[PDB]
Amino acid sequence: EVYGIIAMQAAYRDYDSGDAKQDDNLGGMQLNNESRIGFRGKKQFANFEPTFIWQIEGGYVDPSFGGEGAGLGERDTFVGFESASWGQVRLGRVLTPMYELVDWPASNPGLGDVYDWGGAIGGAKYQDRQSNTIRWDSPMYADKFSIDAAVGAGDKAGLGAGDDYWGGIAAHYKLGPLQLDAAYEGNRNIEAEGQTWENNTYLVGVQGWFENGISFFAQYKYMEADASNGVNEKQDAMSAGLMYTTGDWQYKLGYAANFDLERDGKTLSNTSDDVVSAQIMYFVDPSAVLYARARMNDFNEGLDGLDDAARWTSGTNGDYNEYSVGVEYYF
Amino acid sequence: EVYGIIAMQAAYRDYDSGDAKQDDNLGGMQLNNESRIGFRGKKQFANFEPTFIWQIEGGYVDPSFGGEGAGLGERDTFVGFESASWGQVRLGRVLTPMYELVDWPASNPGLGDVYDWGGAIGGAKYQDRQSNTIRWDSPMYADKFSIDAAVGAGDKAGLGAGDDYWGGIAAHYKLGPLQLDAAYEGNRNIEAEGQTWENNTYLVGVQGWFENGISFFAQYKYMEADASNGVNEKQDAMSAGLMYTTGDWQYKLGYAANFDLERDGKTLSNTSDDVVSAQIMYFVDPSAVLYARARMNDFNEGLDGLDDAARWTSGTNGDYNEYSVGVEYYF
Amino acid sequence: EVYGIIAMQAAYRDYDSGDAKQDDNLGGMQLNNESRIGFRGKKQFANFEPTFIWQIEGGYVDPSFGGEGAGLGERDTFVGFESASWGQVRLGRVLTPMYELVDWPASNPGLGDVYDWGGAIGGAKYQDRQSNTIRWDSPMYADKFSIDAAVGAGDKAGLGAGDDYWGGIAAHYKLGPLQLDAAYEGNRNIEAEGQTWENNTYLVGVQGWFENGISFFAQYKYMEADASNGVNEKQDAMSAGLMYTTGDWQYKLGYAANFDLERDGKTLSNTSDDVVSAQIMYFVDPSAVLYARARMNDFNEGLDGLDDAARWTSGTNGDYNEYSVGVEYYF
Ligand code: NA
Ligand code: NA
Ligand code: NA
Ligand code: NA
Ligand code: NA
Ligand code: NA
Numbered sequence: 001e002v003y004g005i006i007a008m009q010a011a012y013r014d015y016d017s018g019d020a021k022q023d024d025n026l027g028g029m030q031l032n033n034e035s036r037i038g039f040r041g042k043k044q045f046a047n048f049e050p051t052f053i054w055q056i057e058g059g060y061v062d063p064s065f066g067g068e069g070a071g072l073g074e075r076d077t078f079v080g081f082e083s084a085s086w087g088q089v090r091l092g093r094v095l096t097p098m099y100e101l102v103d104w105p106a107s108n109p110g111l112g113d114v115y116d117w118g119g120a121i122g123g124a125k126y127q128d129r130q131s132n133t134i135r136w137d138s139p140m141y142a143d144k145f146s147i148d149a150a151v152g153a154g155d156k157a158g159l160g161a162g163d164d165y166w167g168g169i170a171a172h173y174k175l176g177p178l179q180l181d182a183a184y185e186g187n188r189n190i191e192a193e194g195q196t197w198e199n200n201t202y203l204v205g206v207q208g209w210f211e212n213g214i215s216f217f218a219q220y221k222y223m224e225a226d227a228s229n230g231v232n233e234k235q236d237a238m239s240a241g242l243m244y245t246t247g248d249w250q251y252k253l254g255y256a257a258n259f260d261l262e263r264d265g266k267t268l269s270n271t272s273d274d275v276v277s278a279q280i281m282y283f284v285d286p287s288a289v290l291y292a293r294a295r296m297n298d299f300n301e302g303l304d305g306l307d308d309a310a311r312w313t314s315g316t317n318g319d320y321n322e323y324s325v326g327v328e329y330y331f
Numbered sequence: 332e333v334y335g336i337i338a339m340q341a342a343y344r345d346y347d348s349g350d351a352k353q354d355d356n357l358g359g360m361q362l363n364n365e366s367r368i369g370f371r372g373k374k375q376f377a378n379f380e381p382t383f384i385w386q387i388e389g390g391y392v393d394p395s396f397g398g399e400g401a402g403l404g405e406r407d408t409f410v411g412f413e414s415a416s417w418g419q420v421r422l423g424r425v426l427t428p429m430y431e432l433v434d435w436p437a438s439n440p441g442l443g444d445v446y447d448w449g450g451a452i453g454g455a456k457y458q459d460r461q462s463n464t465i466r467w468d469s470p471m472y473a474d475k476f477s478i479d480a481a482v483g484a485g486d487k488a489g490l491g492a493g494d495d496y497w498g499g500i501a502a503h504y505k506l507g508p509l510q511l512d513a514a515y516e517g518n519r520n521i522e523a524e525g526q527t528w529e530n531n532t533y534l535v536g537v538q539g540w541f542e543n544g545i546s547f548f549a550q551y552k553y554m555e556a557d558a559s560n561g562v563n564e565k566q567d568a569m570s571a572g573l574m575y576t577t578g579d580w581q582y583k584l585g586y587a588a589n590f591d592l593e594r595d596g597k598t599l600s601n602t603s604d605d606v607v608s609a610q611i612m613y614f615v616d617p618s619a620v621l622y623a624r625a626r627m628n629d630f631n632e633g634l635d636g637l638d639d640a641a642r643w644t645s646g647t648n649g650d651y652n653e654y655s656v657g658v659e660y661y662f
Numbered sequence: 663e664v665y666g667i668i669a670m671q672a673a674y675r676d677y678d679s680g681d682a683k684q685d686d687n688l689g690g691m692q693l694n695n696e697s698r699i700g701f702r703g704k705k706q707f708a709n710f711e712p713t714f715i716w717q718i719e720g721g722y723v724d725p726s727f728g729g730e731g732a733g734l735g736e737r738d739t740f741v742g743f744e745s746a747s748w749g750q751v752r753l754g755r756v757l758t759p760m761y762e763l764v765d766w767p768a769s770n771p772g773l774g775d776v777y778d779w780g781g782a783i784g785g786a787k788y789q790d791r792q793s794n795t796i797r798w799d800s801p802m803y804a805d806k807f808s809i810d811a812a813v814g815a816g817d818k819a820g821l822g823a824g825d826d827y828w829g830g831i832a833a834h835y836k837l838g839p840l841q842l843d844a845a846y847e848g849n850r851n852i853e854a855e856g857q858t859w860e861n862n863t864y865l866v867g868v869q870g871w872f873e874n875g876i877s878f879f880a881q882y883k884y885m886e887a888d889a890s891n892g893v894n895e896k897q898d899a900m901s902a903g904l905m906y907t908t909g910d911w912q913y914k915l916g917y918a919a920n921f922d923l924e925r926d927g928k929t930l931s932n933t934s935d936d937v938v939s940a941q942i943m944y945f946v947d948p949s950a951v952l953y954a955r956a957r958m959n960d961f962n963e964g965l966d967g968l969d970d971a972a973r974w975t976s977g978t979n980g981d982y983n984e985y986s987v988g989v990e991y992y993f
Contacts, residue, residue: 002333002664004370006385008410008422010465024494030484031463033423035387035410037370037403039666039699043991045947047910052950052991054668056697056723059731061387061404062424062462065491069390069402071731072699073723079670079697079989091670092695093730131724132693134672153692160727160979163686248378285376288383317491327410329374329383335701337716339741339753341796357822361815362794364754366718366741368701368734392718392735393755393793396822400721400733579709616707619714648822658741660705660714 001041007034009326011064017318026317032064032326036075050081053088076129087138094135097148097170098185098201099128105207105217106239108254109279110295110322115221115239115256118314120271120303122233123197123225124154126185127166132158145173148183156191164189170203181205181219193305196228215243227306234262250281254295261303270301273315288329296321332372338365340657342395348649357648363657364393367406373413381412384419406460418469424462428479428501429516429534433457436538436548437570439585440610441626441653446552446570446587449645451602451634453564454528454556455486457516458497463489475505479514487522495520512536512550524636526558546574562637565593566602583610592634601632604646618662624655663703664993669696671988673726679980688979694726694988698737712743715750738791749800756797759810759832760847761790763865767879768901771941772957772984773918777883777901780976782923782933782965784895785852785859785887786817789828794820808834810845818853826851832865843867843881855967858890867901877905893968896924897933912943916957923965933962935977950991958983 009032015023038057045052056077059070078092095103107116119125133152140146147169154164170183187199205219218240225233239256257274260267277295284290299315310316340363346354371386387408390401409423426434438447450456464483471477478500485495501514514534521528536550552568570587588605591598606628613621630646641647670693677689700719707714721736722728740754757765769778781787789795795814802808809831816826832845845865852859867881883899901918919936922929939957946952961977972978 002370004387006372006387006410010422025487026491028484028488028494028496029463030489030491031422033404033408033410033462035385035404035408037387039664041668041991041993043947043950045950047944047946048952052989054697054991056666056668056699058403061402061408064463064489067490068408068424068462069405071400071402071723071733072720073695073697074731077695077697077723077730079668079695079991091672091693093724131695131730132691132726134693153690156687157690158692158726159729160688160692163690282378284378285374288374288376290379327383329385329410331372331374333701335718337703337741341753355825356818359815359819359825359827360794361820361822362753364735364739364741364793366716366735366739368718389734392733392739395794396820398821399739399755399793400736402731402733613709615709616705619705619707621710658714660716662703662705 001039002037003040004037004331005035005328006331007036007326007328008032009034009064009324011322011324011326013320013322015318015320022318027320030064031062032324033062034060036060036070038075039072048081050083052079053082053090054079084139087136090135090137092133093129093131094133094150095129096127096133096152096166096168096185097135097150098126098168098183098203100148101170101181101183101203101205101219102126102221103128105241106205106219106256109241109252109293110277110324111239111241111254111256111275113297113299113314114258114273114275115237118273118299119223119235119237119258120261120268120300120311120313121199121223121225121235122193122227122305122311123190123199124166124187124192125199125223125225126168126201127152127154127187130155130166143174145171147171154187154190162189162191164191177210178206178208181207193227193311194307197225199223199225213245215245217241229306231264231306233264235259248283250279250283252279252281253277254279258300268303271303273297273299273313284327285329287331288327290325290327292325294321294323333368333370335368335662336366336659337662338657338659339363340365340395340655342653342655342657344651344653346649346651354649358651361395362393363395365391366393367391367401369406379412381414383410384413384421385410415470418467421464421466421468423464424460425464425466425481426460427458427464427483427497427516428466428481428499429457429514429532430459431479432501432512432514432534432536432550433552434459436572437536437550437587439572440583440622440624441608441655442570442572442585442587442606444628444630444645445589445604445606446568449604449630450554450566450568450589451592451599451631451642451644452530452554452556452566453524453526453558453636453642454521454530455495455497455518456530456532456554456556457499458483458486458518461486461497477503479503485518485521493520493522495522508541509537509539512538524558524638524640524642526560526562526637528556528558530554530556544576546576548572558637560637562595566590579614581612581614583612584608585610589631599634602634604628604630604644616660619658619660622655622657622659624653624657626653626655628652664699664701666699666993667697668991668993669988670694671696671726671986673984673986673988675982675984677980677982679982684980689982692726693724694986695722695724697723698732700737701734710743712745714741715744715752716741746801749798752797752799754795755791755793756795756812757791758789758795758814758828758847759797759812759830760788760845760863760865762810763832763843763845763867763881764788764883765790767869767903768867768881768918770903771914771916771953771955772939773901773916773937775959775961775976776920776935776937777899777918780935780961781885781897781899781920782930782962782973782975783861783885783887783897784889784893784967784973785854785861786826786828786849787861787885787887788830788847788863789814789817789849792817792828806836816849816851824851824853826853839870839872841869843869855889855969855973857893857968860888862886875907877907879903889968891968893926895926897921910945912945914939914941914943916940920962930965933965935959935961949993950989952987952989954987956983956985
């Protein structure tokens with residue numbers, strides 16, 4: 001099968017970095033073309049009861065702040081087997097059970113700079129899409145609850161330049177109109193800032209859809225990290241959104257926040273992020289959306305890592321506001 | 332739909348750069364695999380009268396002087412809407428209204444080294460295929476007159492490293508067997524040579540097709556550029572071609588030349604390029620052509636920019652002659 | 663048409679390099695996703711008797727020791743003409759006549775580090791898949807005899823950075839259940855280690871398939887090399903495999919070895935490699951296989967080139983063992 005998401009976003013960014021040239025560069029209007037082509041298949045092997053499944057999805061063909069061009073396999077790309085009895089196992093490049101919940105519902109609309117890859121923790125809060133990963137997805141037992149479980153090699157291990165690995169698990173529970181989410185991920189042998197780290201991230205969350213037209217999601221994230229030199233860091237974050245859908249319209253208010261990081265017992269002042277976002281979406285077709293979105297990002301003021309050099313965050317480049325329109329079509 | 336152009340060229344180059352090792356290096360026989368695969372589609376949204384359109388085109392799969400492999404989106408890749416009433420709007424990566432006329436017909440056959448990206452002017456004479464763009468194509472009003480018009484982000488802005496932008500417009504008028512072309516492009520906030528430039532380019536041209544089998548095109552290009560330190564540059568260029576089409580064959584003669592550059596009123600000596608080109612083409616199928624090509628490029632001898640360092644031109648590598656055989660098939 | 667090979671390998675590698683961190687980095691468990699998507703077609707031109715053919719095959723989508731993402735055109739990608747009388751000609755990216763035999767049958771299962779790209783000789787033993795190649799494949803005359811013949815530009819030459827080139831020829835003769843193979847390749851103008859090399863490689867081999875289910879292959883590879891400073895190098899290599907195919911299973915035992923490199927008549931001690939490999943295969947479907955494989959690589963302990971710095975070989979990273987299971991699906 002050929003499949004694709006044709007998706008373009010026109011976005012104006014006004015930056016407030018404290019330098020006018022830096023404000024001018026990062027800022028301006030760009031087109032964020034997240035269109036992608038994928039190939040997929042299912043296949044019943046003659047001599048194996050579980051059905052063979054496979055997918056190869058390409059990258060964004062021209063995202064903003066980046067050059068043109070994507071290859072096949074840049075996004076979720078795997079082989080695997082699936083069964084009605086025990087769910088599906090997948091090998092290759094997938095979302096980690098923890099990341100999947102961070103991305104959806106928790107990173108939309110436009111909350112990703114804070115809640116996705118934002119944050120000041122050292123090491124690796126979690127992995128997002130990772131190659132060399134095996135992920136088991138359980139069925140929806142009793143039409144109520146599901147389990148996601150994965151282990152994989154780390155970013156350096158997949159280039160033969162390290163021994164990092166990671167494991168994660170997530171569970172979902174249906175409670176009438178609500179879904180309770182809980183997820184966990186641990187990263188080991190993470191080499192950065194001249195140390196070897198261990199990360200542990202925990203997430204709990206709720207999403208609800210109700211027949212009156214209101215839907216909401218709410219998540220709490222607690223990320224801990226310990227270095228080989230004995231320093232321990234802790235960071236909190238949360239994300240929530242409110243949506244009222246009436247006819248062909250969806251109103252959404254989104255908010256997320258990273259809180260001040262705690263290092264070895266000290267609160268580092270001004271290491272917190274938060275973003276507030278509003279989005280109005282029009283269901284222009286059963287297979288497409290049009291949308292307008294506004295967001296305000298207030299990022300942290302900086303922090304150094306355990307090598308006495310600045311630690312990169314989504315706040316490095318500066319505070320900014322974004323006004324965007326976009327379209328997404330699925331085939 | 333899937334579409335593609337299968338295009339292979341066997342080309343011999345004899346260089347005259349003034350160094351024999353480099354003449355041996357750059358010269359020789361190479362294959363120019365300009366093949367590309369694309370996907371495109373249209374869709375009628377239920378709640379939007381204009382027809383939705385999109386295209387994702389890949390790069391040359393193995394061009395000469397480069398490595399193998401191309402990504403999806405390296406070429407014309409966009410979304411847009413269409414109306415029979417007001418034409419079509421496209422957001423994404425498109426040819427600029429001026430570049431389209433520079434490329435076709437004015438760069439064929441093999442005049443591109445001189446007329447396309449050749450030249451000595453500073454800044455950016457024009458953009459060619461440019462990402463982060465909106466381009467409107469008007470209908471052929473009265474089956475005679477059409478407008479092509481676009482505004483877009485610059486090369487640096489699409490990486491968040493500048494605030495360069497550009498606007499462009501082109502118009503075509505049908506006069507019996509003639510089409511009159513006139514185009515313009517202006518680039519602003521272009522950073523190069525330690526300065527910030529503004530470019531303004533103008534083009535006029537005529538192409539004609541006659542029932543006896545004669546066709547020709549002729550273009551005149553005028554590029555001026557102003558740097559922030561007050562230096563002003565001006566350069567003229569021209570391109571013309573003559574073809575006699577008889578039966579399954581087309582004979583072609585091409586010429587293009589860039590003239591000496593003018594900086595602050597001073598003519599820079601020997602900064603002019605020109606190419607004479609001959610091509611025989613065989614219509615091997617309604618969907619394919621074979622061609623043979625001979626081409627002679629005489630390039631400028633060099634110029635320094637306003638940073639007292641050499642300015643790169645298509646003449647950097649040296650004068651050269653080229654003999655080509657090739658095939659192009661459309662599906 | 664679209665075609666593909668969906669191929670994933672889970673492999674544990676135990677290195678024995680003489681450094682513990684290097685054993686930690688290079689070794690471990692990884693996923694080797696050698697999946698690829700391809701496009702190919704044929705066309706009968708109205709005015710040309712031989713049929714036009716073309717192919718664009720993509721790279722490995724997320725191989726081991728590498729990052730994710732592959733372009734269209736990284737593998738066999740060509741245009742060409744084919745006729746029942748005279749076979750087929752191909753221009754573009756293809757395997758050299760010699761390389762095809764080194765790869766198949768002689769590199770399976772897991773003999774590639776030694777017999778494929780392994781060895782200690784200087785210059786370029788052979789090309790494998792190389793762009794800018796014209797390769798002719800003759801018909802199977804009398805269902806007994808076939809020829810493969812190719813000439814091409816070299817790896818530096820395809821970037822406008824050299825004048826290396828190469829030509830090669832191979833032939834196969836079917837004798838009942840045996841096939842006698844002979845191949846040759848000569849590379850010229852190879853710039854490496856501060857000299858200019860000439861390599862000449864010769865190959866002979868036999869393949870057998872018997873009605874009882876036994877198949878075998880065995881090849882003898884002889885590599886010669888001469889540098890511009892007068893140095894002469896010689897290396898011999900060999901590969902063999904034994905197979906029993908019964909029902910849904912095929913057992914494979916493979917061995918290959920490079921012998922000690924001889925430079926200027928003097929044998930360099932411990933410049934020899936060898937690999938032993940066993941693989942058990944399950945034909946899970948007419949279109950797929952599952953397999954388990956174990957292999958042990960013993961590589962040479964080091965070698966200097968003609969610039970007195972280490973010459974890179976397949977052993978530079980260290981000895982290792984590998985245990986892997988995998989799946990392959992064809993569509
Ligand atoms: Na699940
Ligand atoms: Na090339
Ligand atoms: Na450009
Ligand atoms: Na137009
Ligand atoms: Na090569
Ligand atoms: Na053959």
